[PDB]
Structure 1
């Protein structure tokens, strides 16, 4: 992103991340062995801080731009779970897929009453 050329402008960058939820899951797997106390449903007490530390770097500044697409996993089909609920506030466009539409043979199974954009 922050790369320039002599008499040459910058370049646009596309970034693709697959299942950013596994990052928080791996953080969960080692929290107890580090000596912390659990919170919520067995989650680490530093979920939001360590999500935000990574999320604030994926951005576009005055010098260069980044377009990113991420896939977010929803455990046990529960949108109320702390990880997706914390993740919801870091995005500009959110697409929500539902199993009820998928089981009816409709593809892509995008829920039109829960998808928003700025």
Structure 2
């Protein structure tokens, strides 16, 4: 997801455009950073996510912004584990979301 931001940030900071950025399953960004934290021997936080969960998500989502040269807009597919919105992975993600598009069957 940082590789995708870097291609988006060239079009924002050098080309000066309004970039779209699609992060398919932002929860799998969280889940993969939870696995890296567990392999480095770090003690897990609440339910089993990384202790750096708010700052590993927040380090990604704070680079998605509008600047004076351009903009980056992000459409992130959100999975909710066990349909629990109070789970710490969607609850940390929902603090960064500026809109919500629910596609219904």
* TM-score of the pair, normalised by structure 1: 0.70
Q: For residue 13 of structure 2, what is the aligned residue in structure 1?
A: 2
Structure 2 segments unaligned to the other structure (5+ residues): 1-11
1:39–1:66 distance in 2 versus 1, CA, 3 Å: closer
Q: Among 49, 56, 61, which residue is 2:55 paired with?
A: 49
Per the TM alignment, residue 60 of structure 1 is displaced from its structure 2 partner at its CA by 0.9
Q: Which has the larger radius of gyration?
A: 1
Alignment root-mean-square deviation, CA: 1.8
Query: 3-state DSSP class of the match of 2:22?
Result: strand
Among 4, 11, 30, the residue aligned to 2:17: 11
Q: What SS is found at the alignment partner of 1:16?
A: strand
Give the equivalent residue in structure 1 for 2:4. Answer: none
Is the counterpart of residue 78 in structure 1 residue 89 in structure 2? no
Q: Considering fraction of residues, name the structure with more helix.
A: 2
Alignment correspondent of 1:62: 68
Instruction: Report how far residue 94 of structure 1 moved.
Output: 2.2
User: Normalization by structure 2: what TM-score?
Assistant: 0.78
How far, CA to CA, are the matches of 1:75 and 1:28 in structure 2?
Answer: 14
Q: Count how many residue pairs are aligned between Structure 1 and Structure 2.
A: 94
